[PDB]
């Protein structure tokens, strides 16, 4: 959807350099390159929504670095600043680790009007369809979903990737019967409350402090995903609760929650004798709306087009791994396929220098008659600008247009390129990709799946980026 | 002065392509490149003054092609249009012929702030200091001078250049004694009047038609360099002439002069009995101001800085030829000097192919040790980007920085450049400049001065440009 359009425009805009760019300038840049004409304000609203970072927001970690005040938890991000003055910055550290740049070349792209368009789906290192809540880039329809905690998904992927994990075969065993032995619980970060589960439903509860010596009630923790002003109007809606309330003053503030509530002790005695004495929670936390029922709207984008429904978070996750699993296989095979093409290219040029001016002569260089002569010499008729510079080409079309290439990668070089010093750089390079080919050859042969070792390293890189972001003052330097 | 600044900016602006450019855009382009900050309006006024074309204007032929109405003879060019809307176009045909482009590289340039500036003086094919009247690019001081006819200067230069002219030795004889046998008379183009000379002063007279049958006086020709409104206020200044005038109506128009003047026959009888009966002109043309005395302000720009005064037009012309004469010598010698540098360059590359892969090996290409080895091979250590692309360099600095050049004009070429087909283009080229060198060698040896034949051809090119401009509707195509 529009989320993928902004992300691809963001990395393309800051590919040359990652600096400070105005949101309006960034919004126009995104719209210009992908012909997105749904509205600059709507696009800027989605950009702010994607780049917002507040406790309880739909995006736990923003795609772009948040510059300035993009919103607050009181209004649910509706108090964003003017896009003309405020700026946006791409998160170079996280996106590079989360989204593999070299894997972006192999994504399934769609083409319209003879120009590149957005991919149908992005498959990053971790499933972003779980860690992020529901959001509304458009108007009218609001998406609402609850994110799992950032510990259970890591245990799921690490067991599915690392060979030394004790729950490796058991995890694969659980896939066939869909028993889901591994646990999956909602998020807990930036929530100083309680999570309690009955049946198939989850509930969130806030924290309140009652002090007898000073007769002052202190509010500590707000619920998970309700606006502060929404909680205020919720307690001011009921007519009967007005008789129970004498004074309520809002002391909520950003990064500091300390609200004093005045309630006379005369009232506390008769609260518990007409509220049915609920067994789940006390009437003190029942009078104030601190409980939110959870009804997860679990959906995923259809690869063929459309929407799908799943019974549990496991079904979303269990189908996400094979898509990421196949991409690790594809990136290694294509890299191996293109690497050997560079091997024969460098060797042929070095062999050309061996049969150059110093030793042998092939200066005829005829078009058709010498084509067979050069064929007998063993020089491959491979085209340049493709092997040296790969592009959005898959494995099966790579060899077809490379073997049936063209010349001018030979006999059109600089006259200094056939020197001994120039040859030394070439012969010291041909071993480098040959050694790198051995590393790839050692991979793509593991029994579970190709590229298991790199997946663990990519997971560690994601963890390092998250820790560094939360350590400093959101500066990443 | 400012005239040279606009001309150099004009040719530089339209060097890539000659199209329609706005005067304000052209004025800003001139100011930007030469840091001319005397005022955009003043610069635009000078641009319009340089590009104006009206009968009796200071510039008989404008430097730039006149687009739109740049002025009129009635107000003396003071009725120019808005520079924002009107456009200006460079006269590519005339300036290329009048000002030799290849000779512009050898002009004496001054340098300020480490950047190129305007030349001290321009020496074109014909002396522009004679054919153009006086003008005021600035305010306050007005320059006034009278231009000679476009026939006498041609006879002067042709006799001084062409060998077959009968008045060749006699013209050179007149230089020593300053007798000035050749005639020099003021301009006559676009002037249907009379030129009459007494002593050392010249006078211009208009043409009037008097018809007896209809009793209507018709004005035919205005004086040479007076505004039409100036003539009107001149006849309305004298108090006594009001008694002599009954009705005067201005019928003057652009490209159509037909003015009817009403004067009763009763007045004609007593005009001639109180005006002293001037012998030079009749009282009919004496009552109306049709005579202008000539007091030429002959001046030329000092090469060392300042202004100079000359007694006659011959002294200005007799000093102008040696400056143009020396430049013809300089352009041929420098062209001959740089041409042989290109000869040895192409021959060395061809000889390099002869001693290339096919026959000989010199692949060591050491920096210091092989410098003597390549010296024994006869390969000249000349630097490229100077011989192939000449710049503003004189003869004496050309060889000093070319003989003490650097390599990479050899052993750094394309590998296809040593082919037989590539060699054929080089060996068919080396004879071309060698043949062209013979043409230059045949020149620069004539007894009068070098480059006499090209001067005659350049004169013919100037004549062709002038004829074509006046033939079509000022379109030059």
From TrEMBL, chains A, B:
Belongs to the type II topoisomerase family. It comes from African swine fever virus (ASFV). The active site is at residue 85. Type II topoisomerase. Processively relaxes supercoiled DNA. Displays DNA-supercoiling activity only when associated with the viral histone-like protein. This is DNA topoisomerase 2. It is found in: Host cytoplasm. Residues 1-459 form the Topo IIA-type catalytic domain. The gene is P1192R.
